[PDB]
Amino acid sequence: PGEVCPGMDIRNNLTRLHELENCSVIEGHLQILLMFKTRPEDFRDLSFPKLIMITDYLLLFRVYGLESLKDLFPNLTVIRGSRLFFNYALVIFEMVHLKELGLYNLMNITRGSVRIEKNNELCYLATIDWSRILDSVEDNHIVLNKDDNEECGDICPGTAKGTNCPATVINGQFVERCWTHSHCQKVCPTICKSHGCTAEGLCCHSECLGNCSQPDDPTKCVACRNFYLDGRCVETCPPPYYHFQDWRCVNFSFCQDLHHKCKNSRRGCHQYVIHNNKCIPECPSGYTMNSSNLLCTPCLGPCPKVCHLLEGEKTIDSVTSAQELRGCTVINGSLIINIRGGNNLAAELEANLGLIEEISGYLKIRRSYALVSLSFFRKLRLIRGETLEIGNYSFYALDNQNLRQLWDWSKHNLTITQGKLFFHYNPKLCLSEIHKMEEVSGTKGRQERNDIALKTNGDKASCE
Amino acid sequence: PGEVCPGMDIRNNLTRLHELENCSVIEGHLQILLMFKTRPEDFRDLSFPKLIMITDYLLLFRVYGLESLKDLFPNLTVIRGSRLFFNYALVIFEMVHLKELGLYNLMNITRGSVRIEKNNELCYLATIDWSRILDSVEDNHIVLNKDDNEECGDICPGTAKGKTNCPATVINGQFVERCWTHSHCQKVCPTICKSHGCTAEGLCCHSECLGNCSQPDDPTKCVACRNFYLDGRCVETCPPPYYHFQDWRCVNFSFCQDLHHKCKNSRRQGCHQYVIHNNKCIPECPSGYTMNSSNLLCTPCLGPCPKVCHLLEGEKTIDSVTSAQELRGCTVINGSLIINIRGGNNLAAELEANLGLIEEISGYLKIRRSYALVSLSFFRKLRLIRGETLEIGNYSFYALDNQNLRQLWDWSKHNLTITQGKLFFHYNPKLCLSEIHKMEEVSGTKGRQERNDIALKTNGDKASC
Ligand SMILES: *[C@@H]1O[C@H](CO)[C@@H](O[C@@H]2O[C@H](CO)[C@@H](O[C@@H]3O[C@H](CO[C@H]4O[C@H](CO[C@H]5O[C@H](CO)[C@@H](O)[C@H](O)[C@@H]5O)[C@@H](O)[C@H](O[C@H]5O[C@H](CO)[C@@H](O)[C@H](O)[C@@H]5O)[C@@H]4O)[C@@H](O)[C@H](O[C@H]4O[C@H](CO)[C@@H](O)[C@H](O)[C@@H]4O)[C@@H]3O)[C@H](O)[C@H]2NC(C)=O)[C@H](O)[C@H]1NC(C)=O
Ligand SMILES: *[C@@H]1O[C@H](CO)[C@@H](O[C@@H]2O[C@H](CO)[C@@H](O[C@@H]3O[C@H](CO[C@H]4O[C@H](CO)[C@@H](O)[C@H](O)[C@@H]4O)[C@@H](O)[C@H](O[C@H]4O[C@H](CO)[C@@H](O)[C@H](O)[C@@H]4O[C@H]4O[C@H](CO)[C@@H](O)[C@H](O)[C@@H]4O)[C@@H]3O)[C@H](O)[C@H]2NC(C)=O)[C@H](O)[C@H]1NC(C)=O
Ligand SMILES: *[C@@H]1O[C@H](CO)[C@@H](O[C@@H]2O[C@H](CO)[C@@H](O[C@@H]3O[C@H](CO[C@H]4O[C@H](CO)[C@@H](O)[C@H](O)[C@@H]4O)[C@@H](O)[C@H](O[C@H]4O[C@H](CO)[C@@H](O)[C@H](O)[C@@H]4O[C@H]4O[C@H](CO)[C@@H](O)[C@H](O)[C@@H]4O)[C@@H]3O)[C@H](O)[C@H]2NC(C)=O)[C@H](O)[C@H]1NC(C)=O
Numbered sequence: 001p002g003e004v005c006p007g008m009d010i011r012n013n014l015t016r017l018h019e020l021e022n023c024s025v026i027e028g029h030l031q032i033l034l035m036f037k038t039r040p041e042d043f044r045d046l047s048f049p050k051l052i053m054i055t056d057y058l059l060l061f062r063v064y065g066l067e068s069l070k071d072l073f074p075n076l077t078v079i080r081g082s083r084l085f086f087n088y089a090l091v092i093f094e095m096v097h098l099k100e101l102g103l104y105n106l107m108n109i110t111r112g113s114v115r116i117e118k119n120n121e122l123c124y125l126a127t128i129d130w131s132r133i134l135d136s137v138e139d140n141h142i143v144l145n146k147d148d149n150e151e152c153g154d155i156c157p158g159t160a161k162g163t164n165c166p167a168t169v170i171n172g173q174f175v176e177r178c179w180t181h182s183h184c185q186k187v188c189p190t191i192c193k194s195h196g197c198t199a200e201g202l203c204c205h206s207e208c209l210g211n212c213s214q215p216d217d218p219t220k221c222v223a224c225r226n227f228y229l230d231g232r233c234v235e236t237c238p239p240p241y242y243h244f245q246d247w248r249c250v251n252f253s254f255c256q257d258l259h260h261k262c263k264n265s266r267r268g269c270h271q272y273v274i275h276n277n278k279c280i281p282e283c284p285s286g287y288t289m290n291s292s293n294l295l296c297t298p299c300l301g302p303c304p305k306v307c308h309l310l311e312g313e314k315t316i317d318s319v320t321s322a323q324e325l326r327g328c329t330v331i332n333g334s335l336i337i338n339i340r341g342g343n344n345l346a347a348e349l350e351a352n353l354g355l356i357e358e359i360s361g362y363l364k365i366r367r368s369y370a371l372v373s374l375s376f377f378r379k380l381r382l383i384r385g386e387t388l389e390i391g392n393y394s395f396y397a398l399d400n401q402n403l404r405q406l407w408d409w410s411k412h413n414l415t416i417t418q419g420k421l422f423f424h425y426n427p428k429l430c431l432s433e434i435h436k437m438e439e440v441s442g443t444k445g446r447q448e449r450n451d452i453a454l455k456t457n458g459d460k461a462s463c464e
Numbered sequence: 465p466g467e468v469c470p471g472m473d474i475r476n477n478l479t480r481l482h483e484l485e486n487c488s489v490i491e492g493h494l495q496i497l498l499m500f501k502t503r504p505e506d507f508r509d510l511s512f513p514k515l516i517m518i519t520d521y522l523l524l525f526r527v528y529g530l531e532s533l534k535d536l537f538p539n540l541t542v543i544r545g546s547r548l549f550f551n552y553a554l555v556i557f558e559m560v561h562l563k564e565l566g567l568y569n570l571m572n573i574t575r576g577s578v579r580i581e582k583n584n585e586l587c588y589l590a591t592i593d594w595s596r597i598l599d600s601v602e603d604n605h606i607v608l609n610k611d612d613n614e615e616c617g618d619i620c621p622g623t624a625k626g627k628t629n630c631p632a633t634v635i636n637g638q639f640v641e642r643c644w645t646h647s648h649c650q651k652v653c654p655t656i657c658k659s660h661g662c663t664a665e666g667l668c669c670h671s672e673c674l675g676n677c678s679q680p681d682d683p684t685k686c687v688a689c690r691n692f693y694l695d696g697r698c699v700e701t702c703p704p705p706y707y708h709f710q711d712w713r714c715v716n717f718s719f720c721q722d723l724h725h726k727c728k729n730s731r732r733q734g735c736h737q738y739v740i741h742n743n744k745c746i747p748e749c750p751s752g753y754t755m756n757s758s759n760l761l762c763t764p765c766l767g768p769c770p771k772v773c774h775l776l777e778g779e780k781t782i783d784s785v786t787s788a789q790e791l792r793g794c795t796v797i798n799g800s801l802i803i804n805i806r807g808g809n810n811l812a813a814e815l816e817a818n819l820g821l822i823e824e825i826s827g828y829l830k831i832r833r834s835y836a837l838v839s840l841s842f843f844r845k846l847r848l849i850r851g852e853t854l855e856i857g858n859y860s861f862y863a864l865d866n867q868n869l870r871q872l873w874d875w876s877k878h879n880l881t882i883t884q885g886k887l888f889f890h891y892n893p894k895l896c897l898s899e900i901h902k903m904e905e906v907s908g909t910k911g912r913q914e915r916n917d918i919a920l921k922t923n924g925d926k927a928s929c
């Protein structure tokens with residue numbers, strides 16, 4: 001029993017911190033940073049004993065006043081590290097008052113490494129055996145703490161003539177292991193692997209991770225090695241459930257609610273889909289989802305791809321700039337074509353721009369010396385003209401010295417919902433090709449007097 | 465030409481960054497990070513044009529106001545990757561204002577990969593052909609940059625004038641124009657030059673050069689060396705009397721020795737005590753070797769290497785194969801062992817695997833209620849028990865209530881010495897007093913025992929002796 005919370009970045013003041021009040025699990029990361037005015041008194045009776053697990057990482061940076069984590073997160077047992085801070089699952093950095101970690105229930109970091117650095121009061125580090133918590137401690141970075149530069153006096157719980165705490169080896173020295181003066185490190189028998197064990201040493205169930213309340217019972221785990229469902233740790237999610245966030249099982253209707261919740265009010269949320277029995281944010285590469293079944297299916301030809309231009313306009317002046325639109329089938333914005341030359345161009349432009357089916361704004365072709373046709377825009381069938389070039393033009397062609405074809409109007413259809421046509425200084429382009437464009441595109445009658453030049457279109461060609 | 469500087473780690477302020485001002489080579493890594501108050505103006509007039517090479521890795525993280533590296537590190541040509549950050553020789557992470565890399569002289573990354581991640585303004589990535597720089601690009605991790613979307617606006621030299629001044633190419637089906645910024649192409653050499661570099665006129669650098677040279681086919685005119693550096697020259701191997709150091713230069717014994725004795729004297733924890741091995745000066749001895757002390761020289765071990773296990777509070781009880789495992793590799797026990805093994809599988813082999821290298825025990829050895837044991841021969845190499853600590857009653861070797869014990873060691877072959885303390889034997893029904901009396905002879909404990917230390921009636925009583 002417990003609530004699942006999203007990740008949080010808590011800075012400046014402790015105010016939003018109380019949002020963790022009821023979380024047993026953070027589905028995301030937790031960053032606590034940059035609290036310079038906090039002092040011990042602020043933390044004394046501040047505690048989140050419900051928190052068992054974080055799916056990503058825990059980062060603590062420059063938080064003043066805090067001397068231990070033993071009361072904040074007494075029961076945090078697993079950091080999964082599904083996402084990392086670079087490659088770290090735990091970061092403790094310039095915590096200037098921190099005297100111990102005290103994460104006395106931390107059993108497993110499932111992915112990622114540990115970075116503990118520049119904590120000038122920090123002791124009880126030498127007493128942690130991290131090889132029990134992470135598979136590879138080779139990339140841990142634990143330096144410049146009090147422990148290094150000084151004598152720490154890391155006193156573990158212990159009888160006047162033994163030492164209660166378990167002891168493990170460094171290279172050759174056996175060393176007793178603890179988090180605090182009051183708390184040992186839990187160390188299980190090796191047959192238990194990462195599953196945990198009860199206090200009498202009996203192994204938790206193989207679907208458990210870290211710890212359990214009773215031995216060999218997959219309903220008595222503190223956390224799951226694989227997936228969580230209805231009070232039980234399971235190896236995979238059974239039908240009819242889906243794997244979510246790499247740790248819990250959810251039903252179709254849950255996935256469906258995320259999908260619709262998002263697609264509506266659009267922040268940074270995704271419209272969730274189903275793929276390989278997972279409920280995920282978006283279809284993988286080569287897949288798309290257009291059905292009410294939510295199911296990713298392989299693209300019939302090339303995948304749809306909406307490119308929204310936050311600057312409103314993009315100018316294409318090279319193969320390199322064209323490539324920036326590679327794979328796009330819908331442009332939200334306007335395109336300006338200004339290509340003065342290049343290599344294997346008609347083919348290069350068709351490769352990168354040939355899948356665009358719609359442009360919501362305008363299309364402008366200007367000083368594109370190198371172009372003889374616009375037919376590289378193989379699939380362009382709609383310009384909406386929701387945005388227009390001054391003078392209310394949705395298609396505009398100026399000073400293109402070699403242009404002799406727009407599209408082949410015997411095969412290509414192009415619709416232009418709003419706006420006018422502008423054609424000036426296209427000397428190799430016959431007026432009949434322009435007039436065919438007006439007919440095909442539905443722009444007949446929109447053009448005013450000096451919009452299409454009679455004298456500067458086709459004057460260097462033979463026409464009709 | 466200038467100095468070899470050591471690895472640096474620059475944080476918070478730009479003040480310490482000027483420590484690089486004369487460095488040609490950074491021997492170590494260069495990390496610049498967590499500069500929250502810097503602004504573009506702090507970097508408009510800042511340049512380190514002498515830096516040519518970094519032997520380890522370059523890492524930039526959260527440096528505010530820095531927009532390009534083209535003025536900072538214009539001549540950086542090689543990152544050798546001798547040590548890496550994880551598996552990366554180049555790391556650009558959460559560089560909030562970086563618009564381009566601009567490392568337009570970077571020709572080679574000799575070992576390791578590139579990680580350029582979460583740089584919200586970062587462009588001029590699609591324009592870089594990394595295959596000229598790294599033999600394998602397969603572990604590169606270049607994600608969550610401005611370049612992932614459709615509005616970088618990358619533009620290479622010549623474009624405004626309709627020209628492609630850069631050596632553009634197609635790699636797979638991807639066009640890559642090969643530039644670093646609007647005004648700097650990526651350098652490319654004829655195929656015959658391989659990774660050696662060439663002059664502006666296309667003429668090959670010498671085969672001992674790496675990346676670039678001031679003149680063709682001369683190993684004293686290299687910008688950086690393929691193999692090692694000595695006395696103004698790039699060389700394939702270090703000659704006598706020099707050692708290979710940090711995988712790029714030749715140094716002498718005395719240099720390696722001075723390093724060793726700075727670190728020994730001052731184990732403040734940012735160093736190693738350097739050693740000689742296979743004509744290299746290195747941080748530590750590899751596995752199988754230990755360091756001959758009088759001349760810094762790694763010498764191999766006669767059999768497995770010495771390993772002293774210091775027991776907590778001077779004792780440990782072995783009552784399973786699992787606990788015995790915790791002592792695998794030990795050749796010296798500092799403390800005392802208690803054996804309490806009642807059952808299990810394949811124990812003589814398992815126990816021999818984990819305890820067979822123990823040569824010496826400094827305290828006492830006690831076997832009691834070890835019902836499963838037929839012999840103590842699993843202690844294959846045990847030759848000394850010192851008795852520096854003893855069991856109550858001044859015993860260094862104590863055997864009580866072991867119902868199947870028939871052998872201690874085979875006293876034909878095995879020699880065991882017991883420096884101090886006495887023997888105790890009671891309730892060993894299958895162990896002949898001959899064996900015990902032999903052990904007394906072998907170990908030098910004959911005449912230490914009092915009358916009840918060894919039982920006449922409860923050692924061997926159930927065996928033919
Ligand atoms: C791995 O995971 C496991 C499983 O989650 C986890 O084990 C749990 O650990 C927690 C904490 O270690 C346990 O919770 C505590 O239980 C304490 C014992 O509670 C029982 O006895 C109480 C009497 O205690 C006094 O008297 C006895 C006898 O003389 C003495 O031994 C004690 O020292 C002490 O003086 C009693 O209060 C309690 O009875 C009440 O509650 C029960 C609920 O079962 C109810 O049935 C009764 O009617 C009655 O109302 C119970 O029977 C308990 O003392 C402790 O209390 C804490 O909070 C209070 C605030 O009220 C503080 O004052 C106090 O300082 C304590 O912090 C708390 O409830 C839990 O029992 C474990 N579960 C299991 C199955 O073992 C491990 O921690 C994880 N393992 C590792 C290594 O990390
Ligand atoms: C703390 O607790 C953990 C959990 O119990 C414990 O055990 C370790 O478990 C981890 C996590 O499960 C293990 O690491 C994984 O290993 C498997 C398999 O590795 C072997 O086989 C592969 C080939 O199949 C070899 O390459 C490899 O060398 C091994 O021989 C991998 O499947 C895992 O990698 C993938 O999955 C991860 C989890 O989803 C991904 O995050 C990761 O990026 C990899 O992605 C790939 O698989 C996905 C499908 O699942 C797919 O979606 C991706 O696109 C991609 O294809 C991972 O390496 C580890 O082996 C366990 N270690 C041991 C000793 O058993 C820890 O031991 C414990 N810590 C301690 C000290 O107790
Ligand atoms: C950038 O510039 C470089 C030139 O500087 C250029 O060439 C490449 O140079 C690198 C570095 O020299 C070469 O990488 C080495 O390759 C050798 C050859 O391996 C042979 O044998 C093995 C084993 O069966 C096979 O895998 C292989 O097929 C070969 O037949 C390796 O020996 C090297 O590995 C050792 O050195 C590494 C780097 O120090 C170590 O990290 C590694 O563990 C190895 O160490 C062991 O051997 C060392 C002796 O070499 C010894 O010092 C250690 O103690 C230890 O025992 C290394 O991988 C690479 O092959 C060159 N590549 C090419 C194409 O020639 C790059 O090409 C240039 N970049 C670009 C894009 O141009």
Ligand SMILES: *[C@@H]1O[C@H](CO[C@@H]2O[C@@H](C)[C@@H](O)[C@@H](O)[C@@H]2O)[C@@H](O[C@@H]2O[C@H](CO)[C@@H](O[C@@H]3O[C@H](CO)[C@@H](O)[C@H](O)[C@@H]3O)[C@H](O)[C@H]2NC(C)=O)[C@H](O)[C@H]1NC(C)=O
Nearest residue numbers: 002003004229230231244248249250251252253254255257
């Ligand atoms: C598919 O799953 C949804 C969502 O289930 C919820 O989230 C999952 C990830 C798990 O953590 C679930 O344990 C969790 O319930 C189901 O909807 C949920 O159903 C439960 C049970 O009916 C609802 O709780 C109840 O609400 C009533 C009346 O308000 C109370 O009197 C009950 O005591 C009980 O608390 C819960 O409100 C509801 N949640 C949502 C978001 O709708 C859904 O039933 C399931 N659908 C199918 C087809 O199986």
Ligand SMILES: *[C@@H]1O[C@H](CO[C@@H]2O[C@@H](C)[C@@H](O)[C@@H](O)[C@@H]2O)[C@@H](O[C@@H]2O[C@H](CO)[C@@H](O[C@@H]3O[C@H](CO)[C@@H](O)[C@H](O)[C@@H]3O)[C@H](O)[C@H]2NC(C)=O)[C@H](O)[C@H]1NC(C)=O
Nearest residue numbers: 693694695696697705706707713714715716717718719720
């Ligand atoms: C070990 O090598 C070092 C470094 O020498 C330099 O690098 C090598 C790889 C080669 O390329 C060499 O050709 C090159 O010189 C030698 O360093 C030198 O050490 C001497 C002795 O300490 C320094 O001492 C001098 O002492 C007096 C003090 O009164 C001053 O007058 C001098 O200014 C100087 O301090 C000398 O400066 C130093 N040279 C350099 C360039 O670093 C080292 O001698 C050599 N050791 C042995 C035993 O051969």
Ligand SMILES: *[C@@H]1O[C@H](CO)[C@@H](O[C@@H]2O[C@H](CO)[C@@H](O[C@@H]3O[C@H](CO)[C@@H](O)[C@H](O)[C@@H]3O)[C@H](O)[C@H]2NC(C)=O)[C@H](O)[C@H]1NC(C)=O
Nearest residue numbers: 513538539568569650651662663664675676677678679687
């Ligand atoms: C490859 O390496 C060559 C050779 O070092 C580089 O060319 C050299 O560039 C340096 C500047 O980095 C030039 O130095 C300058 O000299 C003048 C002296 O009049 C002075 O104004 C400057 O302060 C500076 O010191 C040097 O002239 C030049 N030499 C040659 C052979 O052209 C070159 O940049 C490297 N890279 C490439 C891509 O070729």
Ligand SMILES: *[C@@H]1O[C@H](CO[C@@H]2O[C@@H](C)[C@@H](O)[C@@H](O)[C@@H]2O)[C@@H](O[C@@H]2O[C@H](CO)[C@@H](O)[C@H](O)[C@H]2NC(C)=O)[C@H](O)[C@H]1NC(C)=O
Nearest residue numbers: 266267306308309310330331332333358359360361384386
């Ligand atoms: C092209 O996009 C514009 C701008 O859309 C804005 O940013 C988007 C990412 C999207 O999330 C919008 O809601 C943002 O407003 C669209 O114009 C807006 O349309 C939305 C309806 O979704 C409406 O709320 C606004 O009033 C519109 N006006 C503006 C300037 O924001 C436009 O509809 C898109 N065109 C096509 C054909 O998709």
Ligand SMILES: *[C@@H]1O[C@H](CO[C@@H]2O[C@@H](C)[C@@H](O)[C@@H](O)[C@@H]2O)[C@@H](O[C@@H]2O[C@H](CO)[C@@H](O)[C@H](O)[C@H]2NC(C)=O)[C@H](O)[C@H]1NC(C)=O
Nearest residue numbers: 357358380381382383412413414415416417439440441442
């Ligand atoms: C050229 O296409 C137009 C418009 O087609 C519509 O809009 C496109 C963007 C595309 O998504 C199509 O599915 C649409 O039909 C044709 O005009 C349409 O004609 C049909 C039948 O007469 C009618 O149902 C549409 O509503 C019309 N819309 C408009 C804007 O007139 C036009 O006929 C096509 N040219 C030819 C000869 O096929």
Ligand SMILES: *[C@@H]1O[C@H](CO[C@@H]2O[C@@H](C)[C@@H](O)[C@@H](O)[C@@H]2O)[C@@H](O[C@@H]2O[C@H](CO)[C@@H](O)[C@H](O)[C@H]2NC(C)=O)[C@H](O)[C@H]1NC(C)=O
Nearest residue numbers: 172173174772774775796797798799824825826827850852
């Ligand atoms: C066995 O070991 C003890 C303790 O050794 C010290 O602590 C270890 C963890 C390790 O770091 C050793 O190098 C330490 O010396 C020995 O007692 C010490 O003996 C040394 C000489 O070896 C002496 O100079 C110290 O003063 C002693 N320190 C203490 C804690 O008393 C003990 O002598 C060793 N017994 C053997 C194998 O002869």
Ligand SMILES: *[C@@H]1O[C@H](CO[C@@H]2O[C@@H](C)[C@@H](O)[C@@H](O)[C@@H]2O)[C@@H](O[C@@H]2O[C@H](CO)[C@@H](O)[C@H](O)[C@H]2NC(C)=O)[C@H](O)[C@H]1NC(C)=O
Nearest residue numbers: 823824846847848849877878879880881882883906907908
């Ligand atoms: C059995 O060993 C003893 C003791 O040997 C010494 O201690 C061992 C742990 C090992 O380190 C040996 O190299 C040591 O010499 C032998 O008696 C010793 O004999 C040597 C050589 O003659 C002499 O220098 C010692 O002082 C002697 N020590 C004692 C206490 O007697 C004995 O000879 C060995 N038996 C066999 C099979 O050779």
Ligand SMILES: *[C@@H]1O[C@H](CO)[C@@H](O[C@@H]2O[C@H](CO)[C@@H](O)[C@H](O)[C@H]2NC(C)=O)[C@H](O)[C@H]1NC(C)=O
Nearest residue numbers: 466467469479480481482483484485486487514
């Ligand atoms: C880089 O080298 C220059 C050498 O010019 C150093 O500047 C000199 O510093 C010394 C030592 O105090 C002064 O005596 C000289 O007068 C300086 N020379 C000039 C011309 O400025 C500088 O110290 C070096 N920088 C670093 C970081 O070591």
Ligand SMILES: *[C@@H]1O[C@H](CO)[C@@H](O)[C@H](O)[C@H]1NC(C)=O
Nearest residue numbers: 003017018019020021022023
């Ligand atoms: C925690 O749980 C209580 C009990 O329902 C609730 O009223 C309170 O508002 C919760 N805290 C938060 C931050 O949601």
Ligand SMILES: *[C@@H]1O[C@H](CO)[C@@H](O)[C@H](O)[C@H]1NC(C)=O
Nearest residue numbers: 386388390391392393418419
């Ligand atoms: C351009 O369009 C706007 C509305 O979208 C309209 O009010 C205006 O009349 C147009 N300008 C011209 C030149 O007619």
Ligand SMILES: *[C@@H]1O[C@H](CO)[C@@H](O)[C@H](O)[C@H]1NC(C)=O
Nearest residue numbers: 854855856857858859884885
């Ligand atoms: C045991 O040995 C010690 C040290 O030599 C000695 O002082 C003591 O008298 C001996 N007596 C016993 C316990 O048999």
Ligand SMILES: *[C@H]1O[C@H](CO)[C@@H](O)[C@H](O)[C@H]1NC(C)=O
Nearest residue numbers: 473474475476477478479480
């Ligand atoms: C950085 O330099 C400032 C002065 O600019 C100084 O206050 C401080 O000691 C330095 N900060 C650290 C910790 O590097």
